[PDB]
């Protein structure tokens, strides 16, 4: 096939994208090996959807594991009586996921499961897969002669031909596993045939943080989580959280072989010594230097210029109220915690008012990074650590180094009742996990 391994592409058909999907323990060939992972649609990653603002999705989700699942459809601004994160379909049963795309919309985002003290384990097995919502501006010639690739990175540990089992320092950390991956693919060559490439960055890891720098080149910003931004902006190097999707314009600078790496990056993961009567939990420290792929410039690369303008930021109205929402931990008992609780399905933490806009600031009192996830409601990131955020976009995951506040301007806008949790995955199924309900 193509070098560079990709998702197969789903597109919606006269304005429908209707899909049965089965979530299944697959025999595959991964990095080299054979392996049982559980999947979407038979593959590792699941299939791409690609699909239109004003768009029906209707996806049929059957439910082939031992045990119940549900899909998350993480950052999609629909409603929490669709993006469901309580409902569990049974093992052998269906449900059949049904929404709108919304009309302003565009970007990067994806699916996985969504049930509290099951997500661990099901989305490091293999359960997720992207969403791709189309833009008008995706016709601007900036855009569209770049050449677009879709990149999900996601880790993977594998024991016996299975999926490695979640140890107990697993459940603290979050696991990261040894097989670094793009698109189910070990350090695949991507040959570039045009000098500008548009490259869509999913993090779909339960735990593993790519700080992403390519060699001998800056990266040009052009989407966030949820949407574009108003206009590049040029990075020496990109952080994706798990959860957090990014869009890149890269511009070739000349013939060669370039690393797109993974560079050491400190999360605050701990481990245990004992040093003499010890016994006492001590940092990992920074993660391994990891080559992701490799990318081949065409012969005497002339890159397009870039876009002079994305998309405008809508203006938000003034907000009617602030929150606090205070991250702890207790490591050695695994637990986490929001304003000292853990997830309680049946309580509820929030409540505000459709279409009002509110401040969230989120509080990292923890010494791991947590990277916050809110559903449903995209927000605006307005600073982290005390530093402004450098663009306006939409996102819908922020990370949190030790310390940090973020402060996020919230629009809420489905009524429901919905979650927000930390998306190292395992400290949700772990509590670190609210209920808010919008009326
Ligand atoms: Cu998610
Ligand atoms: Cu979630
Ligand atoms: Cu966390």
Redesign the pocket.
Known sequence: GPSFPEPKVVRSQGGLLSLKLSATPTPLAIAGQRATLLTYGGSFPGPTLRVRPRDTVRLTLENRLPEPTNL?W?GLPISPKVDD?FLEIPPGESWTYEFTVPKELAGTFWYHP?LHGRVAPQLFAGLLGALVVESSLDAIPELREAEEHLLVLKDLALQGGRPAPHTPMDWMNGKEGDLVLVNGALRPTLVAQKATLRLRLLNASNARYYRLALQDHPLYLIAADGGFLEEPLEVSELLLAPGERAEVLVRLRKEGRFLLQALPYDRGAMGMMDMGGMAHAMPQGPSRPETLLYLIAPKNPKPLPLPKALSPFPTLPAPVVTRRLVLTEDMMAARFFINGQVFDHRRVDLKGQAQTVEVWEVENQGDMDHPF?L?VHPFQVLSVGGRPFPYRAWKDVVNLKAGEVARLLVPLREKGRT?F?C?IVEH?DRGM?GVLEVG
């Open positions: 998350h993480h994160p969504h996830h559903h979650v949790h998306h949700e996990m």
